[PDB]
């Protein structure tokens, strides 16, 4: 007679191709990429003959076979593809095979193949749009936004984006390499701990707790291998397979290492570490380079060289070559993008007409044109055009676009930036003709989280009532609010100025719109980005 029916032993059923060490702070130890997950199953036979061969089946296909030598057994084998499998133990003899009932096993991998889709309702004022314009609709999400801001990946209105950028991936390095981080309490030390035993100029993760270990919706079970932002982003990819999720390397305080990459030894090490990062974290779709900025004038006053423009072009070409190779190895398309200064002087330090051939999208940082760092020269921080009271204003969106086009950049490469926050001043005084910008300030406006910066959610929620004036400057295409009793003046984007940018993008055949930072919107800004680019209302 055929063997008795085996009973699968109670035991762990959750396995991982990329293993996470739960007691490690160094990135080198935190993540272990394997070629396959090590899976184990045991069984007992309570009734009948134990057979002569035991097999482990996954969805009916043998993953392991061995002699059946007694009433209990154990099998260890490898599984090289993530997902969920119906696992059975079968006992066989010459008279037949008898299979256990199925037990589901989970084999995790960093594409999120083991995760249920993270498909969350739109929150606040966000309304559904279809991504059918063919234009970029992008936004950055910041790693540390999950703390005080409480803005997690399940709050991203992901169906309303084509591109979600993750800020920010650091480049390893201590003294002289990441000195800009020392201005943020604890942050330089946090990077040194993440990078312990890891070569300078390789990428890492700045905050492994936020990125991988903090419990979040959909990744709360203790043995879920990937939690935090990365686990949720994997689940988000399962819900939105066409969303491009890009890691952004750099930003204001993590850009110092780029200034050393004129040394090809370092640049090669960096590019290779980016490839390894994308092979490790399969849910990412390419790389965004947020080097602030070639030539200097970013966070570090001691960095910047006339060589930086050449280094930037070489870096883009080598990144593209690495991504093209990764693409044909995987069958996937990978994107290379960069966030760049929108000032003409800064733009002209780089030959973007050359670099554009390596890049899918240029994220033009057409914001922060004015702010509390200068209390004497006030202006619109993210306007399309110059205002009527100063038509020679240098820092406008159009002037940045025009600087790129004049180099020879194709317009379809250029993604115009919108702000989901305001910048502002206090004590504005001595202005003429009811235009507060013609005055001078005494300090920064009180911020939501940081001095001189106010989330758009708070502008709409608190500063559009009471004593606050509201004015839309139709020449500049820029709104502003002003409280005369205290001289508080805030410059920001609203639905109308975003609409003007979207129409400008369509008219000039630009690439689309993007914002920083997604957590600060109440929905008004992203809704307008979508509508103004011609995306249809509804769900896809």
Ligand X SMILES: *[C@@H]1O[C@H](CO)[C@@H](O)[C@H](O)[C@H]1NC(C)=O
Ligand Y SMILES: CC(=O)N[C@@H]1[C@@H](O)[C@H](O[C@@H]2O[C@H](CO)[C@@H](O)[C@H](O)[C@H]2NC(C)=O)[C@@H](CO)O[C@@H]1O
Q: Which residues bind ligand X (CB under 6 A)?
A: 144, 147-148, 168, 184, 186-187, 190, 206-207, 251-253, 449-450
Numbers of helices and strands, H then E, in the chain: 12, 25
* Residue with Cβ nearer ligand X (450 or 507): 450
289 belongs to the binding site for ligand Y (CB under 6 A): no
Contact call for residues 119 and 529 (beta carbons, < 8 A): no
Place of tokens 């291998």: 225
CB of 170 to ligand X, least distance (A): 9
Cis-peptide into 293, omega within 30 deg = yes
* Distances in whole angstroms, Cα of residue 330 to Cα of each of 181, 279, 280, 451, 509: 35, 10, 13, 45, 32
CB of 455 to ligand X, least distance (A): 11
Contact call for residues 383 and 422 (beta carbons, < 8 A): no
- Which of ligand X, ligand Y, none binds 472 (CB below 5-8 Å, type-dependent)? none
* Residue with Cβ nearer ligand Y (208 or 343): 343
* Distances in whole angstroms, Cα of residue 327 to Cα of each of 275, 330, 334: 11, 5, 6
- Which of ligand Y, ligand X, none binds 365 (CB below 5-8 Å, type-dependent)? ligand Y
Using CB under 6 A as the binding criterion, the count of chain residues that bind ligand Y stands at 8
* Residue with Cβ nearer ligand Y (161 or 365): 365
Contact call for residues 180 and 255 (beta carbons, < 8 A): yes
CB of 450 to ligand X, least distance (A): 5
- Residue among 104, 85, 111 nearest 238 (CA): 111
368 belongs to the binding site for ligand Y (CB under 6 A): yes
Q: At what angle do helices 524-532 and 495-508 cross, to 10 degrees?
A: 30
Is residue 335 annotated as a catalytic residue, yes or no? no
* Residue with Cβ nearer ligand Y (427 or 534): 427
- Which of ligand X, ligand Y, none binds 139 (CB below 5-8 Å, type-dependent)? none
Near ligand Y by CB under 6 A, which window of 6-14, 22-30, 265-273, 366-374?
A: 366-374
CB of 251 to ligand X, least distance (A): 3
Question: Pairing relation of β-strands 37-44 and 96-99?
Answer: unpaired
- Which of ligand X, ligand Y, none binds 368 (CB below 5-8 Å, type-dependent)? ligand Y
Kindly identify the residues of this chain, within the stretch 244-263, that bind ligand Y according to CB under 6 A.
252-253
> What stretches of 410-508 show up as alpha helix (H) in DSSP?
456-462, 495-508
* Residue with Cβ nearer ligand Y (66 or 447): 447
CB of 229 to ligand X, least distance (A): 13
| Choice from 157, 173, 371, 424 touching ligand Y (CB under 6 A) | 371
Contact call for residues 257 and 298 (beta carbons, < 8 A): no
Near ligand Y by CB under 6 A, which window of 80-88, 365-373, 400-408, 525-533?
A: 365-373
- Which of ligand X, ligand Y, none binds 373 (CB below 5-8 Å, type-dependent)? ligand Y
3-state secondary structure of 302: coil
H/E element, 57: strand 53-58
- Which of ligand X, ligand Y, none binds 187 (CB below 5-8 Å, type-dependent)? ligand X
* Residue with Cβ nearer ligand Y (245 or 290): 290
* Residue with Cβ nearer ligand Y (371 or 487): 371
- Which of ligand X, ligand Y, none binds 144 (CB below 5-8 Å, type-dependent)? ligand X
Spot the catalytic one: 120, 143, 292, 477: 292
Which residues are CB-neighbours of 241 under 8 A, at least 6 positions away?
none
- Which of ligand X, ligand Y, none binds 148 (CB below 5-8 Å, type-dependent)? ligand X
Place of tokens 């554009």: 356
* Residue with Cβ nearer ligand Y (62 or 183): 183
- Residue among 284, 342, 291 nearest 315 (CA): 291
CB of 20 to ligand Y, least distance (A): 29
Contact call for residues 244 and 286 (beta carbons, < 8 A): yes
Question: With helix as H, strand as E and coil as C, how does 141-196 read?
Answer: EEHHHHCCCCCCHHHCCHHHCCEEEEEEECECCCCCCCHHHHHCCCHHHHHHHHCC
What one-character DSSP code corresponds to residue 211?
Answer: I
**Tokens coding 467:** 């004593």
309 belongs to the binding site for ligand Y (CB under 6 A): no
Q: List residues binding ligand Y (CB under 6 A).
A: 252-253, 292, 341, 365, 368, 371, 373
Please identify every residue annotated as catalytic: 292
């Amino acid at each position: 007679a055929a063997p008795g029916k085996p009973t699968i032993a109670w035991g762990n059923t959750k396995f991982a191709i990329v293993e996470v060490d739960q007691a490690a702070t160094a990135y080198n130890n935190l993540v272990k990429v394997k070629n396959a997950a090590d899976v184990s199953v045991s069984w007992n036979l309570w009734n009948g003959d134990t057979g002569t061969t035991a097999k482990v089946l996954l969805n009916g296909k043998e993953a392991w076979s061995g002699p059946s030598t007694g009433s209990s057994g154990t099998a260890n084998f490898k599984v090289n593809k993530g997902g969920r499998y119906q696992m059975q133990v079968a006992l066989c003899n010459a008279d037949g095979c008898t299979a256990s009932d199925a037990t589901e096993i989970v084999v995790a991998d960093t594409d999120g193949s083991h995760l249920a889709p993270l498909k969350e309702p739109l929150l606040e004022k966000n309304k559904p749009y279809k991504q059918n314009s063919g234009k970029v609709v992008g936004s950055y999400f910041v790693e540390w936004g999950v703390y005080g801001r409480n803005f997690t990946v399940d709050k991203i209105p992901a169906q309303n984006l084509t591109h979600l950028l993750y800020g920010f991936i650091p480049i390893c390095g201590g003294n002289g390499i990441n000195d800009s981080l020392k201005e943020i309490e604890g942050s330089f030390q946090a990077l040194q701990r993440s990078c312990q035993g890891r070569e300078d100029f390789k990428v890492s993760i700045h905050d492994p707790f936020a990125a991988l270990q903090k419990a979040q919706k959909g990744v709360t079970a203790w043995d879920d291998p990937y939690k935090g932002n990365f686990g949720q982003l994997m689940a988000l990819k399962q819900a939105h397979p066409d969303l491009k999720i890009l890691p952004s390397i750099g930003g204001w305080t993590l850009s110092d290492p780029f200034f050393f990459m004129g040394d090809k030894v370092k640049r090669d090490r960096f590019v290779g570490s980016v490839k390894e990062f994308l092979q490790t974290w399969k849910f990412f779709d390419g790389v965004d380079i947020a080097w602030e900025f070639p030539g200097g004038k970013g966070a570090n006053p001691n960095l910047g060289s006339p060589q930086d423009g050449e280094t930037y072009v070489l870096l883009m070409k080598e990144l593209r070559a690495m991504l093209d190779q990764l693409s044909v190895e995987t069958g996937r398309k990978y994107e290379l993008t960069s966030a760049i200064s929108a000032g003409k002087d800064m733009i002209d330090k780089v030959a973007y007409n050359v670099a554009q051939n390596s890049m899918d999208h240029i994220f033009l940082m057409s914001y922060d044109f004015y702010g509390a760092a200068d209390l004497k020269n006030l202006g619109h921080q993210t306007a399309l055009n110059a205002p009527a009271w100063k038509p020679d204003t240098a820092y406008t969106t159009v002037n940045g676009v025009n600087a790129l086009l004049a180099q020879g950049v194709k317009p379809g490469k250029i993604v115009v930036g919108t702000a989901m926050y305001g910048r502002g001043w206090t004590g504005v005084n001595g202005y003429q003709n009811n235009i507060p910008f013609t005055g001078t300030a005494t300090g920064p406006v009180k911020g939501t989280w940081e001095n001189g910066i106010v989330d758009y959610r708070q502008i709409a929620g608190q500063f559009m009532s009471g004593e606050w004036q509201y004015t839309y400057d139709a020449t500049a295409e820029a709104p502003y609010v002003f409280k005369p009793s205290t001289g508080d003046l805030i410059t920001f984007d609203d639905a109308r100025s975003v609409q003007a940018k979207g129409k400008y993008v369509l008219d000039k055949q630009l690439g689309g719109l993007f914002s920083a930072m997604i957590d600060a919107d109440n929905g008004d800004i992203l809704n307008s980005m979508n509508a103004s680019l011609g995306n249809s209302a509804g769900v896809q």
